[PDB]
Amino acid sequence: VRHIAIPAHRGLITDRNGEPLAVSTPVTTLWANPKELMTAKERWPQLAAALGQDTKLFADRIEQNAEREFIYLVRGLTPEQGEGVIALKVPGVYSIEEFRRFYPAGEVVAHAVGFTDVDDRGREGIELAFDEWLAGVPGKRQVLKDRRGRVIKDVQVTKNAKPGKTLALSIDLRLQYLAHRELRNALLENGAKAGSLVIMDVKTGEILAMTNQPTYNPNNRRNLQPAAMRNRAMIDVFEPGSTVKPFSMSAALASGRWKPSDIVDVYPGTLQIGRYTIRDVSRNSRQLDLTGILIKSSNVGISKIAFDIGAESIYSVMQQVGLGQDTGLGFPGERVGNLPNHRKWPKAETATLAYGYGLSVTAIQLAHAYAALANDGKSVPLSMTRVDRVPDGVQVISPEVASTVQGMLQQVVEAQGGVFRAQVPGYHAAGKSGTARKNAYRSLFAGFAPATDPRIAMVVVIDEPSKAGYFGGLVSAPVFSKVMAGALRLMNVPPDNLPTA
Numbered sequence: 001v002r003h004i005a006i007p008a009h010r011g012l013i014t015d016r017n018g019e020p021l022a023v024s025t026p027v028t029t030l031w032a033n034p035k036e037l038m039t040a041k042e043r044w045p046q047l048a049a050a051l052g053q054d055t056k057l058f059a060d061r062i063e064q065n066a067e068r069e070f071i072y073l074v075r076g077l078t079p080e081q082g083e084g085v086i087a088l089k090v091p092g093v094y095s096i097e098e099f100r101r102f103y104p105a106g107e108v109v110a111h112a113v114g115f116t117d118v119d120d121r122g123r124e125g126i127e128l129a130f131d132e133w134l135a136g137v138p139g140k141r142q143v144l145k146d147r148r149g150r151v152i153k154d155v156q157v158t159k160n161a162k163p164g165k166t167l168a169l170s171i172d173l174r175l176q177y178l179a180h181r182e183l184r185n186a187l188l189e190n191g192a193k194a195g196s197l198v199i200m201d202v203k204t205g206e207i208l209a210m211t212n213q214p215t216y217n218p219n220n221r222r223n224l225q226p227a228a229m230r231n232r233a234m235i236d237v238f239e240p241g242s243t244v245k246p247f248s249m250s251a252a253l254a255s256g257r258w259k260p261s262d263i264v265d266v267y268p269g270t271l272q273i274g275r276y277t278i279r280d281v282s283r284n285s286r287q288l289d290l291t292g293i294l295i296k297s298s299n300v301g302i303s304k305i306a307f308d309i310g311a312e313s314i315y316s317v318m319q320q321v322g323l324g325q326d327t328g329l330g331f332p333g334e335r336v337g338n339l340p341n342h343r344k345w346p347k348a349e350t351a352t353l354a355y356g357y358g359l360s361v362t363a364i365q366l367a368h369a370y371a372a373l374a375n376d377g378k379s380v381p382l383s384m385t386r387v388d389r390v391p392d393g394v395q396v397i398s399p400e401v402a403s404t405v406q407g408m409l410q411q412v413v414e415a416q417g418g419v420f421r422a423q424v425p426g427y428h429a430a431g432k433s434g435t436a437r438k439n440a441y442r443s444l445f446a447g448f449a450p451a452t453d454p455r456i457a458m459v460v461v462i463d464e465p466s467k468a469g470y471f472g473g474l475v476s477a478p479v480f481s482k483v484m485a486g487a488l489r490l491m492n493v494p495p496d497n498l499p500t501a
């Protein structure tokens, strides 16, 4: 070896407003030339001590490497700690200036941002996804050494290091902190195993927050529990159950065959389909209108609509809003779930599609589909980076149908017998609860606000709540209420439901 590499300064990662999320910090690595150390053995114990190493094990290491001209002693010290050991003047001890990431927000955005390894290479999250952008390129310095490997000098910088480039995420750290706190709070209030919360800008496709529990502090490389390192919002797939009923309803309203005031008879709350029985969560209904089917969350009601309009129409809307489909994000480990298709849809599969059973999605997909509904039926491609020019997007549901469904979902939140815990102080909001039997349950709420001129969509997933209440409208709805109330205020959306008159 006639060169040493010159590490490049890795690009700053910020939130959408320039708040630092991953910052390259100076550290110093110490290395030694055993051939030189072998001439200076009386110094070894002082050096061993400086390095926190056992005297005899350190001596054993040097002796075993006596034929080598390079070994690492320790990596990633503070500059001051490194200078401290260099100041001992032990022959054959040298230092290299390197970088280590610091993550100022720690566990709050750990799953989005990810982490680098000891060599400063991205290995999880955004650090990995945008590694090429962030990394820049190392330089090279030619060195002169004697025949024992003693470093005499730097001869010159052959190649200069090129710094990596700054990256501004879509995340709004203010919203990320709020979501993080409120998801953690709800997890603890419910004794739950895990959860995720996603907030999206419905107009721009930006992911404004994406938080999961459990989480981890990426600044601390000890312990490390891989289960806490899971970006569940992107990696965990789940059956969305009742939260997809608004897409079934969109298909119904688009077919020409259904209007909101139409009635379906769901008595006696079960419906036999050959060997399979559809069963409603509550079984105290006969006639329901279409908004009532959503309020009551009736699997029987949505199934009967599905039989009438056919599964193909429902599958198309779900596919178009992105359920079970690749997001087109860069993101390491992201899963796609599954939206089943059929050459010919049998009756059972038509019903189960319509109420979200036996298909699987991620929280990011579900939030993206709600964002399309909220954005007057126009889907904008997802982004984990700040969006300055908004892409054109794709009109997936007709604006009229989107408008009608928005209004129904506002009634789901606001009407008698609805999901009152999702109501957002100061604002009209809209959305739909779900509960999936995995007994072990996952509690869901998906929605957007304000209900007119929607601005943000949100999905809350609470995995295995362990108190007697486990329904999405009980467990996840209040998290939507609190997080939406804070997020809208932070975004300076004027309240559209303050008390009047």
Ligand SMILES: *C(=O)[C@H](CNC(=O)NS(=O)(=O)n1nc(-c2cc(O)c(O)cn2)n(C[C@@H](O)CO)c1=O)NC(=O)/C(=N\OC(C)(C)C(=O)[O-])c1csc(N)n1
Residues within 6 Å of the ligand: 239, 240, 241, 242, 243, 281, 282, 283, 296, 297, 299, 355, 356, 357, 358, 417, 418, 419, 420, 421, 433, 434, 435, 436, 437, 438, 441, 444, 471, 472, 473, 474
């Ligand atoms: C939809 O997800 C569907 C039916 N379950 C729900 O709609 N849960 S919820 O919509 O979040 N929800 N339902 C109720 C509720 C319950 C009642 O007994 C009565 O009478 C009225 N409402 N609440 C309470 C709110 O009204 C308070 O405001 C809700 O929040 N899910 C399923 O069909 C699935 N499993 O169902 C359960 C009942 C969990 C089960 O079978 O054990 C399901 C769908 S996909 C899947 N794997 N499971």
